[PDB]
Symmetry: C3
Subunit: 278 residues, 3 copies
């Protein structure tokens, strides 16, 4: 009853938004990139660009966080057509997990087959340094709300297997690219937590104990939903501050944005080659 | 005000459903069994059976998960009258914890004094094998919603003690039965998590670090509420897949159901003797 | 839209309640004390006292937990004017985190610059004994709802830094006072969890693994919001029961209250001197 009508209404919104976007587009991208905090300038590398602001898209959330421009960018990255979310949505803004991940449902209907996720994070692995790029090999969902709770959208499984949520072959390829380009990359586990407070030292320590290498407030829900949708996932987390015991200092979102912006060109090189060698 | 009217409305629903069921019943069971995924065929061992479908019961949730038949079964298991929930409800379906546990509140009013809980789970203890029966000696509530939040139903404590949530004497008796019958049993801690995604390898590892031996998406809320109600609890978790580091493979709910169905006869032997020797 | 109107309505309630309280007050306290379970008799040490019951304050929650009297007390502790919350609010009662922490938002508008938080807790550090006072040096937020989710109240940061949530200088001063008075104090990490069940042995063990020294069902949300408000925090947790592996026994809220009441005079000595030497 109520759970069903909720799902029906969501399917209607997905179709209305997807129809709206097809009516605006003149390319057929098969890869999408979600650009997190400070990482929006990847879009300066997109050619033949055109843009649709989130505020103009029916049913779309809007980005309220500083450093999230709030537009969809279409164009070529290297020689392949892509679409990029220049800015994303977070559960701490007040959005439900179904609103946070609504764009991934719409990307499925637009023909996206691969999703690249990026974010700024705090490093809990003591080997990490600010500015490191961490290829995400697995994640921990530490949010209190799961985007798939409720009636199942029937094109994916009621109970998705998550043994390989991040495509192993894309990671192997990204490693090869990074080695050829001489770009240092880390690898590890991202934990997603609601925020919006940065962690206490005890909370950073907790996340280290649980096996996380980097912590942030995004990404996990979009990966879950991409997995449900059958969309392949690659993810890079940019370490923008340290949550390492003995090394914690005051952090600010302003400094996070500057650190992410400084690392963006190396991240974009890897993603551009990953798209273009496939 | 609002929390109170909510409780009042819940008490009204409990009484209306309990009155409905008393009006259909012609036995007085003092033990109830909740049958989880793949475990419904315990009901083929019940004699003098009669059934009430969940869809016909006022205020009852319905089971939407494959492998949950959705009926209450009354009859004798061995020589004692029981009632069995052939199928249960889960928080990942969209039900609130007060809906998930509503049947335990109704069982209190029907005179149930002991609750047996069963489920299918993923094993995180590296000694476990698919098909093992794990007697639940304690649990970890890892769900984001607690069934007792809000105004307290005054026949139980505001703050239940949970030092012995699973009756120690029923575990001792079940161990003795299993030894006499030559049925191998494990013992350990069940962790309940919302789902509906199966765990990533990092999440299985997290649950091992926290001290869990098996993980699933049910059972904990019903045990909490049974404890509040003064109903004694015994629980068996059937290990249907491994979440052990180095041994993880793709899992599916279809294979979970087949593994649980294969273990059901040994589980039922223990429960039948436990009921009949008391 | 909805998140904004929600915030606007909350700002209106904060101002209406703060105006109401200013209209009743005839002192200008700069320190407030939140008194948890069993700790209300600190208010017997306040001189020139006057009281406002929570039920008479517009928009205030009321305390439904035994041992929480439900009034605001104004007067002098030593020679400084203070205000004390004699009783607090908890998420397990059904209150949202914005209701639980509404008094801290109102205290900001009343001119409070320092908040002392007190609570009764279960000890997970094996060195602790019932009746110990634990100065809180850091905390772990294990609640499923964060008081800052949603639109940010613009006088504090979207993303508060939490590297020093508990003022280090107040802890140093409290340690010095305790040493001069010969009062034994512990120091450690408080973890806040929703409740209302006391923890299972497995849950107490989990909290020990995560690095907690004491566990309770309060305090963290108020500290988060005080931090957002720019109000300095000091906190003492009174260990009222043990959640130490091998030493767990049945606990009751009645016994918790008696244990907290027995420790209150030593807690009050430290807080009174901390207020009066500043
Ligand atoms: O140390 C951290 N802890 C949690 N999140 C973040 C972030 C992420 N960037 C934002 C805050 O800078 C926010 O959206 C979060 O997801 C950077 N560093 C950290
Ligand atoms: O490995 C697991 N992780 C989490 N839950 C389950 C289950 C339980 N059975 C269902 C999915 O097969 C679901 O209701 C869950 O509670 C079996 N194996 C696992
Ligand atoms: O062992 C414990 N676990 C969790 N909370 C508490 C408490 C706190 N006091 C109340 C229950 O006695 C409740 O509000 C909780 O915050 C004392 N001991 C414990």
């Amino acid at each position: 009853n109520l759970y069903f009508q909720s799902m029906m209404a969501m399917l209607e919104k997905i179709q209305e938004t997807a129809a709206f976007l097809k009516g605006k587009m003149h390319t057929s991208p098969e890869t999408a990139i979600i650009l997190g905090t400070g990482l929006g300038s990847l879009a300066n590398e997109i050619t033949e660009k055109y843009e649709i602001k989130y505020e103009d898209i029916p049913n779309f959330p809007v980005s309220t966080v500083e450093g999230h421009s709030g537009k969809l960018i279409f164009g070529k990255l290297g020689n392949k057509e892509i679409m990029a979310m220049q800015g994303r949505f977070h559960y701490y803004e007040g959005y439900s997990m179904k609103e946070v991940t609504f764009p991934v449902r719409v990307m499925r209907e637009l023909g996206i087959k691969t999703l690249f996720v990026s974010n700024a994070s705090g490093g809990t692995n003591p080997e990490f340094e600010i500015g490191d790029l961490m290829i995400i090999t697995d994640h921990i969902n530490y949010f209190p709300e799961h985007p798939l709770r409720g009636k199942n959208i029937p094109y994916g499984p009621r109970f998705p297997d998550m043994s390989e949520a991040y495509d192993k072959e894309l990671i192997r390829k990204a490693d090869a690219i990074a080695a050829e380009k001489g770009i240092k990359v880390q690898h590890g586990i991202y934990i997603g937590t609601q925020g919006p407070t940065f962690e206490t030292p005890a909370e950073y320590k907790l996340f280290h104990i649980l096996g996380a290498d980097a912590v942030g407030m995004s990404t996990v829900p979009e990966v879950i939903v991409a997995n449900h949708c059958g969309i392949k996932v690659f993810g890079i987390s940019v370490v923008t501050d340290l949550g390492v015991e003995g090394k914690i200092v005051e952090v600010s979102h302003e400094e996070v944005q500057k650190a992410a912006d400084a690392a963006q060109p190396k991240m974009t090189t890897i993603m551009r080659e990953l798209i273009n060698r496939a």
